[PDB]
Every structure is written in C-alpha cells, then in structure tokens.
Design a protein around this ligand. Structure first.
Ligand SMILES: [Cl-]
Ligand SMILES: [Cl-]
Ligand SMILES: [Mg+2]
Ligand SMILES: [Mg+2]
Ligand SMILES: [Mg+2]
Ligand SMILES: [Mg+2]
Ligand SMILES: [Mg+2]
Ligand SMILES: [Mg+2]
Ligand SMILES: [Mg+2]
Ligand code: NA
Ligand code: NA
Ligand code: NA
Ligand code: NA
Ligand SMILES: [Sr+2]
Ligand SMILES: [Sr+2]
Ligand SMILES: [Sr+2]
Ligand SMILES: [Sr+2]
Ligand SMILES: [Sr+2]
Ligand SMILES: [Sr+2]
Ligand SMILES: [Sr+2]
Lengths: 186, 95, 154, 160, 140
RNA sequence: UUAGGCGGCCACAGCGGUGGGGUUGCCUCCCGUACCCAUCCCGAACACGGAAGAUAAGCCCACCAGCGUUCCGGGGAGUACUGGAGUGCGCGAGCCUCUGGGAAACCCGGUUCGCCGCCACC
RNA sequence: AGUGCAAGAGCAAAAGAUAGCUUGACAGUGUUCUUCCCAACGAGGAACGCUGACGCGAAAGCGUGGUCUAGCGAACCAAUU
RNA sequence: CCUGUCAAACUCCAAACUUACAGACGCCGUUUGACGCGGGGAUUCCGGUGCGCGGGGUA
C-alpha cells in the first residue's frame, strides 16, 4: 500500500479468517481435516482434503439440512452441533474417509464447546479423530439438558416460535436415533 | 573469504525479496514428491529448518526416497555424487 | 544451408570454439563443411564467426566444389555424376547439390565425407584480421562473395 | 602533491564514510554563486564548462578553478552582478597515500575528489546577453586549473 | 438507519495513576466492581527502576455499572470542547474516561473476520458532545 | 456463492472513495447470562442461550484510478552495459569497428479497484 | 521494536511480549552434509531419521538447548559412571 | 515545492554472462569398448607471459 517495499499479508490473513501457523501444523498430519465452524444461527462440519488448486471438501453437513431428517428445533445450540458433526461424519464414511484431525479455525478450545461437540459427533459416526474426552461437555449437555433447565426457570417461554414449551433433549435422541440407523438417505 | 563458515557469502541468496518477506505459504512445505522426480533446490529465507548447505542452491536433483518427512535428493557436485536431506519447503518440481 | 570454411588456425583459439569447429566436422584450415540453417547450428557458427567464412553458395558453385573436392566416406574413389548416381539417392552432382542446399540430406548421409578439403585461395583472400564489412574475409558472406571464395579455393 | 597521482579512475569507489575516518574537509567554499536568490530560467544565456575526458578532480582543484572563475565574474560584473554560476559536482571519492616499504601499504586518508565523466558539465553560468563574453573568459581561466581539456559550450543563447 | 447509528457508552475507565495502590479501596466503592493494578515499563530516574510493579489501578465499567457511575461522575466535572477526542471520546476528573461508539463496534473487537470500523461509522466530536449533552448536562 | 464454508496464487488482490442489498432464507450487527467457558477488573472479548429489532458497520453486488502495484504500447533506446574477434584509433587513462546479446530511470497512452479451485445453497 | 554478544540474514494471530506450567540443555543408534567446493583427510558442527523415556497442548504438533552462521582439542595417563 | 550531487562493506530495478537438470541436433562409443570401476608406477606442490576482470601501490 504505502510503497514498493510494503508487505501485504496473504489475502486470507488480512480477511482475518485463516491462521496459517495453525494450518501448517494441521496439514503436517497427512490426514483430512474435520473443519468445524459456527455462525450465530448455524454450525457446519466439513471433511477437507489438500488439493493442487485449493482444498477439497470430500463430505460435510450443515445444521440447516438437519431438519431434512426431522428437526424442528433451533440450529445454534449444542444438540445442533453434535448431530451435525455426526451427520457430516456419517457421510464421510460413505466417501471412504476414515480418519481426521480437528481444525477449529479461529474458535477457542474451550472445554465442552460446540466445535468439540461437532468432534464427538464425527467420532461417533465412526471417524478416527485424535481427541481428549475430558475436554468434551458431559453427555447431557450435548443432549441439550442445560437449556431445558434454563427453560425450567420459565415465566416467558425460552423459544418464541413454539417448537415446544419445556423444550426437548428427548428430540435430540429421536434425531440421533435416525442418524445412527442404516436406511437414512445421506 | 575472511572466514569459512556455512553462511559465508550467503548475503544475497539467503535474503528474501521484500515482498516475499514473512512466513511462507504452507502448501509448498507440505508438498509430496515421488522417487525419481526432478526437483530444483532453493532454500526459502523464511524457513529455518530443513535446509541443505547453501552451496547447493540452484541444483536440480532426483528424489530417491525420504528420511522422516524430509526428502533424500541425489545431486552431482562437480564430479562427486552427494545425497541431500531437504524438506519440501526448499524444493520445487521441475518443468 | 551455409558453406563453412576455416580460415584461421587453431593456435590460440579458444578451446570451446575449437571443439565447436570439430563438432561441425572441420579439423584443418581451408577445410569446408555444409551446415543446415537451424537454431542449433545457428548458435554454433555465430560462435566460430571470427575464425571462419560462411554464407549460402549458389547451386552452380556448390556443383563445382563438390565435383572438384568431394570424397567418399572411405577410399580415393573419385566422385562424379557416375559415382553420385551409383552411390547416392541422386542422379548426378546437381541432384545432390540441390538436395544439400534445400537441406534434405547431408554428405555423410550419402556416404560422402562431411568435409570438402579445399585448396588455398587462388590469388589469396581478403585477410583474416577483419570481417567482410571491414574489407576482410571473416564472417558471413554474400552468395556472390561466398562463391568468389569457394571458387578461388576449388 | 601532483594530480597525476589521482586524476585517473583506476581504483574502486571509496566513499562510504561509515567505514572511513579522518576525511579532510573540502576546500570548496561555495557551489552556488552570483545572485542565488534568482532562478536560472530568468536568464537569456546559459553557458557551461564541459569536461572532455573522464577524470578525478581533487577538491583543491575545484576550489582553484571555481575561485579563479567567479573572481573574474566578480571583477567584471561587480560583487552583485546580474549573473549566477554553479559548480555542480561534489568530491565524494576519498583519496589515500602510502606515506615502511610495501608492507602494510594501504594508505592514510589525505583528500577528496569529484569524478567527472567526459562530456559532463562541471560548471554552469546563466548570464544576460551582455556578459556572455565575460563568462566565456571566466571558464577559460577555470579550465586552465583542472586536469582535462574542456569545451565552453553555449546552451540557451541564439544571439550570435 | 438512525437507530444503528445513535451512539452509546462502550466503557467507563476510572483509574488513579499514582507511582508506587492503597487507593484501590476507594475505586472499589466509587464504581462498584473490582479494580486492577497498573504495571509500568522503562526505567525512570525518579526511583522507578522496577519495570513490572504496582504504580496505579483502574476499573472498566460497561452497561449499567458504567451509566450508574456517570450519573454521579459527570456532574462532578465541567465538560468542554477540547476535552474531547477526535474519535468521539472524552476524559475528565482520579481520571474518568468515557469511550463512546456506534452499535456494531464488535466488528473491530471480535476474533474471527474482524475489521476496522470505516471512518463513516466512527463517532465524531460533534456527534459525541451532542449525544452526551443530550443527557443530563451542558457543553463547552 | 440474493449475502456461506475451506482454500490456491499471495497487492493485477494494497490505500482511498461512490452507489446498491435482505419479514419466518444466508452472513452479520443485534438481544441476553441458567448453564459449559470466560476476564491478573469488565458476558468488551472468549463461551454459551437466543430472535425484539436492523441493513447504519461488516459482508456480498456494481463501480471510480487520485496514491501504491502487475502487465502492455509508444518514446527514452538498440541508448547504458556486454560475451566473441581485430597489425582499428589514442602519449595515455581510454575509444572504435564487426558479430551475438541488451537494460534502468523517466514521460505519454492504455491495463489493474483480483484471478482460480473444492463444497454447500432458490 | 524486540529477539544475550560481531556482522549479514530470519521472524508479527511470531521466532517478539506477558502469564502459567515444565525440564527435550534427556538415553540409545543411525542417515546425510559439513569440516576438506570440485577431490582424499581427524576432532568439532549441523540438518534429518529409528528406538526409549518424558513435558506441554483439545489436537494436529512442538521440544535432540538459546531463530541461523563463532564460543573449540589427538594418543598416552588419571579420576569418574 | 523548487534546485545541486553520491556509495567496495545501499538497492524499488537490472543485464551481457556464469551455472544445475532434461530433451533435440551435432560429435563420439559398442573388433579403436566409450562412461564407470579396481589395482601398479610416477612426476609435481619455486612458475612465467599475453588478453579480460580485478585488489594494493605515485608507479
Ligand atoms: Cl467459525
Ligand atoms: Cl546439504
Ligand atoms: Mg554481493
Ligand atoms: Mg579418406
Ligand atoms: Mg593481407
Ligand atoms: Mg449502505
Ligand atoms: Mg598505439
Ligand atoms: Mg604424552
Ligand atoms: Mg574426573
Ligand atoms: Na516468505
Ligand atoms: Na501488580
Ligand atoms: Na450497512
Ligand atoms: Na565428524
Ligand atoms: Sr589500480
Ligand atoms: Sr587543462
Ligand atoms: Sr452484549
Ligand atoms: Sr603521459
Ligand atoms: Sr535482439
Ligand atoms: Sr534451533
Ligand atoms: Sr563468475
């Protein structure tokens, strides 16, 4: 910008979306990356592989396409994240993918977070992913319990669009139920 | 030379071009080459490890297997055959 | 196709320039060779430029010189139309001459020695210390100039 | 010491003051002369002294010539005459002398000189059409104190 | 348009740069929340050779804590023009600093895809004096 | 790609600027702290839970060249420099001719306000 | 800017700063290059492996001392494990 | 703004050229066996001159 000698960061560095130092460390494994990402309303898992002209996504799942299997609940919570990971995971098996490394991009490794939920889901789907159990939220939180009890302290329904009053982690089960099953069109 | 260390006279060849300054892209550090492949040798100023003796900059050897992640490249220094342990970051495919 | 004639000796000649001459089959002063006009050969003559005289000869001249100085790959067998006819893909020296100039074949290809061992220039040449443009004999010549030389060395 | 000792450019450029110490101050008093508050475009005539050979001119020579030239323009146009002359070169080249046989011969620093390629303008004056022959004389005296031969070329000036 | 543009208070930073502390207790009362120590850098002839070491304390208030402080703090001062930043900030007073900014300031403070706020969205001195003055006090 | 995710080349992509875009869609800003997690003090951030509002930021779309940058035309310039050769010139430092290469600055006019790959998506 | 010290070079979500934790400045054994361009020569050095045991990290991964190039010593004998 | 100058230990630029590898043509090798490899024997480790590029020195 300033002159001939000025150094401009690689595009994705100035867009502030890619941590290259962390990236290179991920790539050093030789395994596909389980790219876990999240937005205010959604969550998304992708199994990315290295390619000659850019990365190559071999499979993926999005919280949005969760309803496509019987989900009427929100898509920015824990139950959401896990199930998406699993959905993405299952599809990964389809394409022949067997192992992955967790890439949480610019998200923080907070214990019990969603990117870890996405990871536990993808692992349950059958993907071999280097992990650590005592960094994953407790099973019930994944189900969505923490929110039910939050809804317990009612007075004004937690959810605006009536999906249900006292919410449901039991639905999480019906949805996971449907995914771990064979039939299901991936 | 006044001294005979490895980086003697390496001022230019080991200095980065202003705009190439800073951490280099991971792509070429992770690249994979096959045995028999021709590769040009050129140290990347920005990359500390995996380098070969500067004196060999500019060579175009032949991947003949690898050691760990580093590559074993065969070259002919003058009339002598030498094997060079070098990481992808400092290699480039030929042609 | 250019005719190449060595006019300057090997003593004190750069070795890489001397080796180049030998690759073009000339090994003595006055010896002449016929080289196709390719990028590769082009570089070569440009390199030997200061110790030689070259240029494209006329069909006629090439015929005179072939008749007078062409030799078999081995032996003293005289090379004439009859020889040409019974040993080459041609009918006579002219058919050969034409083919060479058109670069369809080479002396070696037709069992002829790659070199024409010419004779010293009758009446001498224009000197080997200066190029053609400066009045000398070194360097690229005119088809007419090359002809004058080759004929004088017939 | 004879200029024969330094007039030629037969040594590497030696100018880096960050590695040289004890460099004698220049003897050149001024590079801008005449009425320097006025511009150069403000004059009808522009004459320069052109060096004919590439050389090295020691500061003691730039000062002698510049002086013996401006001194003339002063004596002819007055201590405030309507003219302006410029010595456009500065002595960047540091000179030595081995002043103990050839052992440890690198020399001690003894002076400075300006490198001037042939055809370049060493000095340049801008005068009115009147004082044109006064500047030509100032240069005649100037080129008599510098090694090379010079041409007194007349740039803007078609009043012949 | 005006809604997502009308200013707000990002933070109220009250601090007592001393130079060697025992003053934390008052700020703990005047603001309502815990204060933090202030380390320094560079050695100073003024018996200040201990780089890392207590020299001050500060409190950063946000939302109610912030406002509830200004309600009783602003009156204590006599705001002026110069006393304002070029970004729309102003500090008075024990220092009392008020950082004002428009709605989506987060874009420059978040981790992922952060970005610098365009000059157009940056608060102005005039815009600052206004908003503020437009709430319990005068200007210059 | 009517706004997304991961990238490759890493300014042709920077700097600055103008215009346009969103009722249950997307990205955001945005709302809010019971939880997982968080601040040497601050739910600012990080993390989590969420939709009253919004297109003013960001972002995406269209575009402008004043600065920076890439490339190209024309001029500078076949100049500067130079590999090979010379019983060519010069008192000399040095120059010239023939042969094969061939800039840089700068001015003028254009180009450039990213290109491309994988995935997902009214 | 800083990165212990010459100079040249490297580094910005770090190779710099702060904080916390830690002892990989670890054991065994090699490959290669360097020392010694080409081209034989020791001690010394570096990069890169395999095995062992550990530290930190969610994990990929990083750690065979200090970002890279100076800080080094044969046989005989002694002491030591 | 304008205007006057520089760099062996400066470089936003940048040759000629030197150089790694490969293919092509050339030359060469498969009774003259090249390239490569093993072994016997050395001599040699005062050099000089021209030209080009130098560094020191008034030379
Ligand atoms: Cl994300
Ligand atoms: Cl090496
Ligand atoms: Mg150099
Ligand atoms: Mg014969
Ligand atoms: Mg003669
Ligand atoms: Mg708008
Ligand atoms: Mg002479
Ligand atoms: Mg002894
Ligand atoms: Mg002992
Ligand atoms: Na780089
Ligand atoms: Na403290
Ligand atoms: Na907007
Ligand atoms: Na050794
Ligand atoms: Sr000299
Ligand atoms: Sr003179
Ligand atoms: Sr908030
Ligand atoms: Sr003389
Ligand atoms: Sr040309
Ligand atoms: Sr290191
Ligand atoms: Sr060289």
């Amino acid at each position: 910008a300033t002159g001939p000698r000025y150094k401009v960061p690689m595009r994705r560095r100035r867009e502030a979306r890619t941590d290259y130092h962390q990236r290179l460390r991920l790539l050093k494994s030789g395994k596909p990356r389980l790219v876990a990402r999240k937005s205010n309303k959604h969550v998304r898992a992708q199994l990315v592989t290295l390619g000659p002209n850019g990365d190559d996504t071999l499979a993926s799942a999005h919280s949005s396409d969760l309803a496509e299997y019987g989900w009427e609940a929100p898509t920015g919570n824990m139950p959401s994240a896990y199930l998406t990971g699993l959905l993405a995971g299952l599809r990964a098996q389809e394409a022949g993918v067997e192992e992955a490394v967790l890439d949480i991009g610019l998200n923080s490794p907070t214990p019990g977070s969603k990117v870890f939920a996405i990871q536990e889901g993808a692992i349950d789907a059958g993907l071999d992913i280097p992990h650590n159990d005592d960094v994953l939220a407790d099973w019930q939180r994944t189900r969505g319990a923490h929110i039910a009890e939050y809804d317990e302290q009612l007075e004004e329904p937690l959810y605006s669009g009536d999906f249900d009053a006292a919410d449901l982690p039991e639905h999480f089960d019906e949805l996971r139920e449907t995914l771990l099953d064979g039939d299901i069109e991936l | 030379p006044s001294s005979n260390g490895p980086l003697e006279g390496t001022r230019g060849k080991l200095k980065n071009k202003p705009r190439d300054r800073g951490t280099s892209p991971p792509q070429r550090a992770v690249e994979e080459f096959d045995d028999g492949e021709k590769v040009h040798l050129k140290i990347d100023p920005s990359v500390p490890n995996g380098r070969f003796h500067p004196r060999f900059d500019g060579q175009t050897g032949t991947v003949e297997g690898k050691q760990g992640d580093a590559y074993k490249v065969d070259i002919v220094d003058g009339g002598k055959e030498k094997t060079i342990i070098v990481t992808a970051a400092h290699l480039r495919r030929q042609e | 196709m250019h005719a190449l004639v060595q006019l300057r000796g090997e003593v004190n000649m750069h070795t890489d320039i001397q080796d180049t001459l030998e690759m073009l089959n000339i090994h003595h002063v006055n010896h002449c060779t016929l080289v196709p006009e390719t990028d590769a050969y082009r570089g070569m003559v440009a390199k030997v430029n200061d110790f030689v005289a070259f240029g494209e000869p006329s069909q006629e001249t090439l015929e005179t010189v072939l008749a007078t100085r062409a030799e078999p790959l081995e032996g003293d067998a005289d090379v004439d139309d009859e020889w040409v006819a019974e040993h080459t893909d041609y009918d006579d020296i002219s058919g050969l001459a034409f083919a060479l100039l058109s670069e369809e074949t080479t002396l070696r290809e037709q069992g002829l020695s790659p070199t024409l061992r010419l004779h010293p220039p009758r009446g001498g040449h224009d000197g080997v210390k200066h190029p053609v443009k400066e009045g000398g004999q070194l360097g690229k010549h005119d088809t007419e100039g090359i002809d004058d030389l080759l004929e004088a060395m017939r | 010491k004879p200029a024969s000792m330094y007039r030629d450019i037969d040594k590497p450029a030696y100018t880096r003051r960050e590695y040289i110490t004890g460099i004698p101050g220049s003897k050149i008093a001024q590079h801008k002369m005449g009425r320097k508050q006025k511009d150069a475009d403000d004059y009808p005539v522009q004459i320069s002294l052109i060096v004919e050979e590439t050389v090295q001119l020691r500061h003691g020579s730039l000062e002698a010539s510049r002086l013996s030239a401006n001194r003339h323009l002063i004596k002819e146009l007055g201590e405030e005459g309507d003219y302006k002359m410029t010595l456009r070169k500065f002595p960047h080249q540091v000179l030595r002398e081995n002043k103990d046989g050839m052992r440890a011969a690198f020399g001690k620093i003894v002076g400075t000189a300006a490198r001037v390629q042939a055809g370049e303008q060493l000095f340049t004056a801008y005068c009115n059409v009147e004082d044109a022959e006064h500047v030509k004389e100032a240069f005649r005296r100037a080129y008599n104190k510098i090694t090379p031969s010079c041409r007194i070329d007349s740039s803007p000036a078609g009043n012949a | 348009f005006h809604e997502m543009r009308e200013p707000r208070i990002e933070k109220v930073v009250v601090h007592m740069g001393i130079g060697h502390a025992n003053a934390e207790d008052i700020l703990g009362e005047i603001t309502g929340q815990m204060p933090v120590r202030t380390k320094a850098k560079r050695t100073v002839g003024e018996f200040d050779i201990r780089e890392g070491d207590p020299i001050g304390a500060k409190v950063t208030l946000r939302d109610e804590m912030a406002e509830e402080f200004l309600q009783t703090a602003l009156p204590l001062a006599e705001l002026a023009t110069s006393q304002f930043d070029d970004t729309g900030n102003f500090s008075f007073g024990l220092d009392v600093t008020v950082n004002l900014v428009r709605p989506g300031y987060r874009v420059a403070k978040r981790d992922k895809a952060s970005r610098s706020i365009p000059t157009k969205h940056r608060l102005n001195p005039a815009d600052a004096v206004a908003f503020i003055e437009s709430t319990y006090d005068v200007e210059v």
